[PDB]
Amino acid sequence: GVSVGKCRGILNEIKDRNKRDTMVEDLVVLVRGGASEHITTLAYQELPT
Amino acid sequence: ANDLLSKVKKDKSDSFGVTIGIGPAGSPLLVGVGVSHSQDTSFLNELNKY
Numbered sequence: 704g705v706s707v708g709k710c711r712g713i714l715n716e717i718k719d720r721n722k723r724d725t726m727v728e729d730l731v732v733l734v735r736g737g738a739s740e741h742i743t744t745l746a747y748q749e750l751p752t
Numbered sequence: 753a754n755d756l757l758s759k760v761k762k763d764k765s766d767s768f769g770v771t772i773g774i775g776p777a778g779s780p781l782l783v784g785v786g787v788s789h790s791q792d793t794s795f796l797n798e799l800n801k802y
Contacts, residue, residue: 704772710765720755 759798766791 730748745752767790775783 705770707768707770708766710767712763712765714761714763716759716761718757718759720757722753722755724753 754802756801757799759796761797762793762795764791764793 732746732748734742734746736742767788769786769788771786773783773785775781
């Protein structure tokens, strides 16, 4: 009597993830005339008006 | 942002055994042989990078 056996197994797993985000903003103002307190109030870069 | 995940696993087994018994004589005789083997292998490796 002769008995023989063979077994084999393999597992492969690869994972990849990429994330890229970009955002910019720019502002240019050019005001001529009446450089008093009110135009400094209007010189507020965040609010548009 | 960058993300990398790698995991590998390998499992292998082996089992074999030969049982041979033969006895020839004028008088009654008996020959018995028993052989059995077993192999088990497990491997695991995981990598994660962020």
